[PDB]
Design a protein around this ligand. Structure first.
Ligand SMILES: O=C(Nc1ccc2c(c1)CNC2)c1cc(F)cc2[nH]nnc12
Lengths: 156, 39
């Protein structure tokens, strides 16, 4: 159905009315989202169907129609924009300077912006508009606030 | 059955609302893709 490049909402009619479970990026004919949003299930786009192609529960990422296409990375210095697409509200760019998630396997950028769980899959962008990762997988701090990692896949 | 709806273009917006802090957090990632706080 609709394969135009851009940010999309991931919806469901299983619960009461229509509910936004997440968000994703359509790029180069491939739909990219977080695994916990779809659980690997097929998606509908108008009258067309999007079947999963690649997924991994640990990276919490999934691609539809083709392999992961997003390859840009945060440079460790610059501010970034979270293109937040929240449930029932318009898409909105929120600029922030990312912090760090220090892990046993290396450092990862992290955005400290709080949004509902249905915002999962919202793209994080660099100054050229390139997707450097997706928002939706992180942790809950002392504050009760949510700090998400800048989760990026690997392009083959 | 899940479905998708376009929500906009992927562009950088000059003069966007600049907010949010930059914390350095010690974390762990389990086999189920869940992060946790190491203290
Ligand atoms: O719960 C959230 N994310 C998530 C859920 C289930 C799983 C994973 C991540 C990875 N393994 C399975 C979440 C995402 C978000 F954008 C804002 C949030 N505020 N409180 N929780 C959130």
């Amino acid at each position: 159905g609709e394969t135009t490049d851009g940010v999309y909402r991931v919806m469901t009619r299983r619960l009461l009315g229509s509910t936004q479970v997440g968000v994703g990026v359509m790029q180069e004919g491939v739909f990219h989202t977080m695994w916990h949003v779809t659980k690997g299930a097929a998606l509908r786009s108008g009258e067309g169907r999007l079947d999963p192609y690649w997924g991994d529960v640990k990276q919490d990422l999934v691609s539809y129609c083709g392999p992961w296409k997003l390859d840009a990375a945060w440079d460790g210095l610059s501010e970034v924009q979270l293109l937040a697409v929240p449930p029932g509200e318009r898409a909105k760019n929120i600029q922030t300077l990312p912090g760090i998630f220090k892990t046993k396997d290396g450092d990862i950028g992290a955005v400290a912006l709080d949004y509902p769980a249905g915002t999962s899959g919202s793209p994080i962008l660099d100054k050229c508009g390139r997707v450097i990762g997706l928002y939706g997988n992180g942790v809950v701090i002392k504050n009760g606030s949510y700090v998400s990692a800048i989760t990026q896949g690997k392009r083959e | 059955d899940m479905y998708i709806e376009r929500a906009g273009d992927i562009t950088w917006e000059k003069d966007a609302e600049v907010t949010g802090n930059s914390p350095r957090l010690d974390v762990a990632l389990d086999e189920s893709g869940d992060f946790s706080l190491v203290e």
